[PDB]
Amino acid sequence: QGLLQDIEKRILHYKQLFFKEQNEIANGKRSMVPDNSIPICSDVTKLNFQALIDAQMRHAGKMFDVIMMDPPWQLSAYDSLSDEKIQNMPIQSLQQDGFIFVWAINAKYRVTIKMIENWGYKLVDEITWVKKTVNGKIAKGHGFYLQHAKESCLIGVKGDVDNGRFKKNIASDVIFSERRGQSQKPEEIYQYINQLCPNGNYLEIFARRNNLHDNWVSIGNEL
Amino acid sequence: DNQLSLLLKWRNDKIPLKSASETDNKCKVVNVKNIFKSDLSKYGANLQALFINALWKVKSRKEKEGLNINDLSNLKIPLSLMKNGILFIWSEKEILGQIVEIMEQKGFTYIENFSIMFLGLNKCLQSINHEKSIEQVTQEKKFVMNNLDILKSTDINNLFLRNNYPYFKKTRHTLLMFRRIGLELRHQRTSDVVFEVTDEQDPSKVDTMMKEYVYQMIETLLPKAQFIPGVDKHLKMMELFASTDNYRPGWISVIEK
Amino acid sequence: PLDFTQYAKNMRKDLSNQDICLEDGALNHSYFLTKKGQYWTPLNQKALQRGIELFGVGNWKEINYDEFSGKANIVELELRTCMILGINDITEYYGKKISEEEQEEIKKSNIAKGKKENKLKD
Amino acid sequence: TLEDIENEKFTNLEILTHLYNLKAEIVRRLAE
Ligand SMILES: C[S@+](CC[C@H](N)C(=O)[O-])C[C@H]1O[C@@H](n2cnc3c(N)ncnc32)[C@H](O)[C@@H]1O
């Protein structure tokens, strides 16, 4: 029948495209993922954090300067974790002198403040990301008392943090940028971190493949 | 482009500054040497709202005066005073955690947040062209709002305000909301984000026509705490650290004097 | 340390998968050019060649039973066999046991057809 | 539902997201 013939022709076309793509890859076709990025695939509960710490001492000689977290809260995601499991993370060992960037939702603002306190940090700052549209207007949202049009990145700090590698009074606490793919943080957060800590060691937890950047150690199930 | 015709539209809409009401049954004015040291259980009972117009004394605000965060702890809010209602309070960046912990140790649960995005007026004036008093700043803001189609080509990130702060530059001012459960709320009618053109000397001291925005937000969030004449024999909204000149109808104004 | 190329190489050698890092410590860009869980490893290629020499082209049901690759995609199996043989039409090459190809060289050097994508055309 | 198979952008291997099973669908539909 005709549909079989059309399917066969489309199969041949996509086969030729497939074969060209793997020929190009075998030739040495580079990827969108930058070099000098250290991706780690694991589960953070089952992760052997001592091995990661020992490797970081062996190569870099000192622990991470900025830690960013976008925890999988029990609000709906499809891969959530309990608040006590996230609290049980050995975050106190991964860092001694530096910043932590935790993206908190409104429902988890208070528990985020509590965990940042328990981990040994002091809440000193907070960056608001105001969502823009393609037209340049404010993107609306949903809430209980008010409409939500922003997201919060609570910023704690512990230990000696002004030691010649962090920069003070750098960039605004507001990011007015367009909404990219779902749950994807704006790209300007990495530029702000670069302004805060130039060419340092950074660790990001619960990472996806779109979060891979130069000099960033990333830990995630899909990454 | 900027779309500032839509981000600053509330400043040309049907929001005028409201004229104060004299001492009558519609408003009540109380003069107290200190709210943080006095018993508020007698000035009003069953308060459906409690806005604390607190200006805080922090390191960010340099060479200024204001309240102190340690003095909020010993502010008694008896249950008879305050059974069901929302408490509103201005927050700095240094004291947000202290505010939330102190309010949790009293019976109030954090529910929401409200921030003001600040655009500088000097930048807007310079883009338009190619110690100030309050009336002078008012007429400058009117001038900016008039020629609102000359700076339309400018990049909005170039007009934002960038005040000095130890970690990231200050561009917003936030109002925290806490709730105590023992309200007939109206839910989603105001966004968490509002844009304002402001003078750079002290943006924390919100002026009129924006304080009016906050009053309208609070009074549309709580459409049953309005003082209808004759129907209600007691006021249901209390605003601490009031302005000695403008007594908003339907509120209890407490002025430190 | 002040060398992020070598630092990244060493960290990827010690803490990253073998499918994410090369032997010398370089990023395996083929891994990141495909969706996760669909990367064809050199172990899979070796297992495919071993199955071909064991059983032949034939049908691919047996190779998916003894599970040389760990229950991989069978479509990738009858697609990546064409790359080694050099012809996108293996219907006439059915059920043949081959250890050394001896066919890719002769069938990739036909000037009459289009030698596009390092492959002869039907 | 023929055109929707490729409208979404996939990786090079996944682009046959149903031609994998359409490879046997054609055989079964030719059988009967
Ligand atoms: C809520 S985070 C948001 C994703 C990312 N932060 C972004 O901006 O796109 C979701 C990611 O967390 C990761 N994740 C979930 N559970 C994890 C776990 N137990 N250990 C490590 N990563 C996990 C998953 O891989 C998932 O991609």
Residue numbers in the entry:
A (entry chain B): 140 to 215, 226 to 372
B (entry chain A): 98 to 227, 318 to 369, 375 to 449
C (entry chain D): 11 to 132
D (entry chain C): 152 to 183
Authors' own words:
After extensive cryo-EM screening (detailed in Materials and methods), we obtained SAM- and SAH-bound MTA1 complexes and determined their structures at average resolutions of 2.6 Å and 2.8 Å, respectively. As the two structures are almost identical, for simplicity we focused on the higher-resolution SAM-bound MTA1 complex and described the structures of the components in detail. The SAM-bound MTA1 complex overall exhibits an “L” shape architecture, with MTA1–MTA9 and p1–p2 perpendicular to each other. Specifically, MTA1 shows extensive contacts with MTA9 on one side, while on the other side the MTA1 N-terminal helix (NH) protrudes from the direction perpendicular to the surfaces of MTA1 and MTA9 and directly interacts with p1 and p2. The co-factor substrate SAM is found in the MTase domain of MTA1. Specifically, the SAM molecule is positioned at the end of MTA1 β2, β7, and β8, facing the conserved DPPW catalytic motif (residues 209–212) in MTA1. The adenine moiety of SAM is recognized by the side chain of D182 and the main chain of V183 in MTA1. The hydroxyl groups of ribose are surrounded by MTA1 N370, E371, and R357. Several residues, including D209, S332, and N360, directly contact the methionine moiety of SAM. In MTA9, SAM is not found and an eroded NALW motif is observed instead of the conventional catalytic DPPW motif.
The Tetrahymena thermophila MTA1 complex consisting of four subunits, namely MTA1, MTA9, p1, and p2, is the first identified eukaryotic 6mA methyltransferase (MTase) complex. The MTA1 complex comprises four protein subunits, namely MTA1, MTA9, p1, and p230. Both MTA1 and MTA9 contain the MT-A70 domain that is widely involved in eukaryotic RNA m6A modification, but only MTA1 contains the conserved catalytic DPPW motif, which is reminiscent of the heterodimeric RNA m6A MTase subunits METTL3 and METTL1433–35. Neither MTA1 nor MTA9 has a nucleic acid binding domain, and p1 and p2, two homeobox-like DNA-binding proteins, are required for the MTA1 complex’s MTase activity. Coupled with biochemical characterization, we revealed that MTA1 serves as the catalytic core, MTA1, MTA9, and p1 likely accommodate the substrate DNA, and p2 may facilitate the stabilization of MTA1.
